[PDB]
From TrEMBL, chains A, B, C:
<comment type="pathway">
    <text>Purine metabolism; purine nucleoside salvage.</text>
</comment>
<feature type="binding site">
    <location>
        <position position="217"/>
    </location>
    <ligand>
        <name>cytidine</name>
    </ligand>
</feature>
<dbReference type="InterPro" id="IPR011268">
    <property type="entry name" value="Purine_phosphorylase"/>
</dbReference>
<feature type="binding site">
    <location>
        <position position="241"/>
    </location>
    <ligand>
        <name>adenine</name>
    </ligand>
</feature>
<dbReference type="InterPro" id="IPR000845">
    <property type="entry name" value="Nucleoside_phosphorylase_d"/>
</dbReference>
<feature type="binding site">
    <location>
        <position position="199"/>
    </location>
    <ligand>
        <name>adenine</name>
    </ligand>
</feature>
<feature type="binding site">
    <location>
        <position position="241"/>
    </location>
    <ligand>
        <name>hypoxanthine</name>
    </ligand>
</feature>
<dbReference type="GO" id="GO:0005737">
    <property type="term" value="C:cytoplasm"/>
</dbReference>
<feature type="binding site">
    <location>
        <position position="198"/>
    </location>
    <ligand>
        <name>cytidine</name>
    </ligand>
</feature>
<comment type="function">
    <text>The purine nucleoside phosphorylases catalyze the phosphorolytic breakdown of the N-glycosidic bond in the beta-(deoxy)ribonucleoside molecules, with the formation of the corresponding free purine bases and pentose-1-phosphate.</text>
</comment>
<feature type="binding site">
    <location>
        <position position="199"/>
    </location>
    <ligand>
        <name>hypoxanthine</name>
    </ligand>
</feature>
<feature type="binding site">
    <location>
        <position position="241"/>
    </location>
    <ligand>
        <name>cytosine</name>
    </ligand>
</feature>
<protein>
    <recommendedName>
        <fullName>Purine nucleoside phosphorylase</fullName>
        <ecNumber>2.4.2.1</ecNumber>
    </recommendedName>
</protein>
<dbReference type="GO" id="GO:0009116">
    <property type="term" value="P:nucleoside metabolic process"/>
</dbReference>
<keyword id="KW-0328">Glycosyltransferase</keyword>
<feature type="domain" description="Nucleoside phosphorylase">
    <location>
        <begin position="24"/>
        <end position="269"/>
    </location>
</feature>
<dbReference type="GO" id="GO:0047975">
    <property type="term" value="F:guanosine phosphorylase activity"/>
</dbReference>
Amino acid sequence: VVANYENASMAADYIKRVSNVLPDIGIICGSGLGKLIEEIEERKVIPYINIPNFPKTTVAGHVGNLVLGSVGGRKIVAMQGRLHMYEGYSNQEIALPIRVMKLLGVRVLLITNLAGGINRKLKSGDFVLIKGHINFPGLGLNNVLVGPNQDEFGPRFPDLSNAYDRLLQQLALKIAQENDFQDLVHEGVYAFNGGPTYESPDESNMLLKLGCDVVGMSTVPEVIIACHCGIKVLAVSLIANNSILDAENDVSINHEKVLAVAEKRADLLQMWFKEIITRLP
Amino acid sequence: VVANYENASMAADYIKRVSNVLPDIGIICGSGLGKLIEEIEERKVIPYINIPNFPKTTVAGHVGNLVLGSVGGRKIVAMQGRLHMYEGYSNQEIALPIRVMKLLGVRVLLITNLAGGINRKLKSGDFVLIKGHINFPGLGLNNVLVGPNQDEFGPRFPDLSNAYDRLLQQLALKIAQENDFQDLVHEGVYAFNGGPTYESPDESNMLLKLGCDVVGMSTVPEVIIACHCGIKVLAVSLIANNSILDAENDVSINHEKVLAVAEKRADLLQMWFKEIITRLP
Amino acid sequence: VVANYENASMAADYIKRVSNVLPDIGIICGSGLGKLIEEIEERKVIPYINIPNFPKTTVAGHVGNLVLGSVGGRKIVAMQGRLHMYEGYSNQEIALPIRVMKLLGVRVLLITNLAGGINRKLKSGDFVLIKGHINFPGLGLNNVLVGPNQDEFGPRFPDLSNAYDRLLQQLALKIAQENDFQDLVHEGVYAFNGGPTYESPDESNMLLKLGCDVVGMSTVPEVIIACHCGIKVLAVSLIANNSILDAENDVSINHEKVLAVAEKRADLLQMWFKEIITRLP
Ligand SMILES: CCCCc1ccc(C(=O)O)nc1
Ligand SMILES: CCCCc1ccc(C(=O)O)nc1
Ligand SMILES: CCCCc1ccc(C(=O)O)nc1
């Protein structure tokens, strides 16, 4: 199944017939960071299995739904579940849900993820507003856009210089200042490690030399598909650990430690994103 | 279809029966930079669709032909059309036309492309004689030679240290000096970005740190296939923009701006390559 | 064929019925560096073609066997043949033999390879104990673990910080000191170049900037599969040449030169690994 205009249109028509919500905001939440989706008002849950042309999501298993409703008086659509490229999904499978968001009317996409810190100023539990990226898969012929271009969505050769909207970053910071947590909020450059192995100690040292502030295994594919079709993006990393300090001290990382940091910041992040949604222009 | 000896031989036999030209020079011209192909004398046009085993080129659409004839008294074969890896073509599809050139008798391959400038000395409209490369796809397991080796063409483990012939670079520069445009001509290292997104501002800054002078989305696959089978190469980049200055100033790039630079230098480049062809040893 | 628990179990059951050896040590030897396999005592040779689910190894051709027996009073299993990713084998094909080693009882995996030197201190004929790596394929979405996770073997997100066991490196060095060849033995970081082209001169210069000591086209995939399932690893590179000196002097490299260095060090390496095997805890 190709992420083309006909296939996206069939999915969008189905969603419309079922939901009667026309969203202008989309959200994708990182693992352990999805409690906001549980508080959507007047919500309608649409499983991927019912949506024409959506990818199968039961080899990896676990959840896989679209949730439409209201937050802070705004009409939104949330992606629940996980579709990451380290799982073996194709370019076309990652792109189709974002292109359907476009056809439903989405103009702004908000994303959170879990990442490792590279910059020496970053502590476990800090937040990073992403201002740019280094896309190792893209440099290496695994860009999400490799394949025929789908002209109805965007151009053959997109420019990513404004992929991360500046005014959205400024609003996120303004809210942090209003609630006395700006000391936790930084800005920086996100390195995309295809994964699923964590960055090795020597890879972390390389990323420091190359000007990266954080590293993770998601987000950049969705950002590129959104930018290609004219959707504005805000992306925020939660820092699980500092990989440079861990390399210098011979300290390990694991998914359990990552999930405990997610639990420690889950309430703060949910409240922050609810306020961002409410105040978006 | 594999780029093997039998499949290449069948294509070569067809071309011979149709053309009665045995070329010793091949040319591949960048987008907007192909007017030279229109001035080939006594020309014969052979569409890919008629050549046994050649790849299909109608999903991307647009042109796709081989043109054989004379330029400056020399027998040449030109590739018209575009076969780039960001479009989804396989290793075997990119390699087959170059291996057919080898079987027809080609000893020298001349290539032009459009690229972004990384070195601070480079201005829009300048030319770069490529003296080496950094192949991000190759480091990352997407080299054009991944797969079984085709022993009739070359070795399992090729050396690329002489991929860009030094005497051909010197002749290109000599002609520039003779015609008072040497101030536009530089030498440098080409970074291969698989594409199709332009390099991000932070990727451009990384490439500066790593010793790259220019960046583009083509050329390196063809260079590697040519070097593997003993064909000498000259490759020249036309600089569309300086990506480091654009990153520092928050300035965008698009395919339209790139094509306007191609128009501004098209006549000069056509005249330069005609003289290179005439004077090749 | 997927490298899953059922398929690995069927292969392991076959091997057991044929061999009556339960090995706790596995070995993978680099090209020209396999004479040790010829001295295995009470050996049983099991060709891949007879083992349920093992990959086909006749396109590349040449040898392909498992050899079980005793060395220095220890029970071992050796992989004879070559399964490298530049040949076009899939993630699942590389991983299956290592996962079968796990099911047979292997706890330690010993690996040798041929590599190019980047650090200026390295001479042709030196040895490097690998202490970490930079995995360009992994950063670029070609990690050996891309795909569904096989939960019986290991976790979705492995940590590689202890992939290269420190005590095994210390034992290898102790034996070198006991036999007056420690002047040949270094430690360092291994860069994985997917291949099959040797690193270009400008790629070599980049790797120097990024903190790499050696570069090669193997080893990292097997290390990652072993680490994922709890097998300890020692990996040693034999240096064929110094690629930084060769770049500065305009000197070429070829597979013939590499194989002559392998011949020059083959006896020393065979004797070293026999003593390592004998003395493993
Ligand atoms: C009774 C139908 C529900 C079972 C089901 C749910 C989800 C998926 C999928 O997302 O791939 N497949 C099947
Ligand atoms: C009447 C036959 C010409 C139509 C045609 C031309 C080119 C191609 C191709 O290059 O894939 N396919 C079909
Ligand atoms: C008579 C059977 C032996 C011939 C044979 C040997 C090895 C392989 C392989 O490893 O793919 N295939 C076939």
